[PDB]
């Protein structure tokens with residue numbers, strides 16, 4: 001049965017609530033973004049209205065085979081009416097097509113549902129600034145002070161320079177980037193752009209990318225692995241054994257691999273700045289772990305919420321245990337006392 005944190009009070013709306021079968025009273029199902037924990041349950045068998053971004057809609061049609069009649073794409077940054085209620089979709093700065101949803105309730109309450117997001121100061125000059133937001137449904141993935149990470153830009157500059165050096169030293173080296181979902185596409189796009197190459201990948205991954213409305217995409221990606229010096233593989237294959245095996249598949253065209261494993265946070269964010277990163281190396285294979293996050297750091301999340309000044313916060317991540325809910329509630333109370341709301 002559907003949780004309270006997936007329901008928008010005083011409407012017949014839900015958000016990211018596809019795994020409970022038919023939700024009693026739901027007239028419109030919103031989907032924030034195309035990551036499997038959020039879409040779980042959606043298939044060609046679904047027969048109620050789904051509201052989402054254009055990119056998400058492209059993925060629902062082509063990858064999950066949802067029938068077109070049930071997909072309702074909405075533009076960004078535009079006031080729209082759904083079942084008699086004013087809504088706005090905003091860029092979530094998460095993966096391609098990911099949105100936040102602003103609901104203007106009939107009784108005058110304003111609710112923001114972040115979906116999954118990486119808070120940014122640019123959000124403070126969006127449509128959110130035009131009126132008071134009363135209730136916040138918040139992506140709390142990294143709601144603890146130990147969770148620091150570098151900017152996306154610092155991580156991309158390190159990746160570009162690392163790849164350019166390695167391939168200029170050894171023109172027969174291949175660059176490999178791991179992936180398991182949409183998101184983090186700039187890692188492999190920026191490395192391929194510095195090397196003057198297209199990115200090569202499986203037919204299934206190419207199909208996905210061709211749904212993302214990336215300008216000039218046909219000049220950037222290919223299914224002809226041979227022709228390319230940057231390849232995509234499943235994240236599970238980014239290990240010494242998998243990378244040796246891949247090297248043997250490529251028909252001796254390369255004699256070395258440099259690989260990137262974009263992760264979330266792992267224990268060693270605590271000590272190490274990006275410039276100090278050194279790879280794990282076995283023979284002619286070297287692997288870099290790079291902390292490229294599409295979620296808010298603690299500091300980024302805190303800044304956003306202290307600017308917004310909500311009257312109530314409803315967490316949407318790590319809500320299955322008491323301990324976790326209690327710890328998050330302690331930080332929300334600190335933030336509120338510090339900022340005076």
Ligand code: NI
Nearest residue numbers: 033035094116
């Ligand atoms: Ni996500």
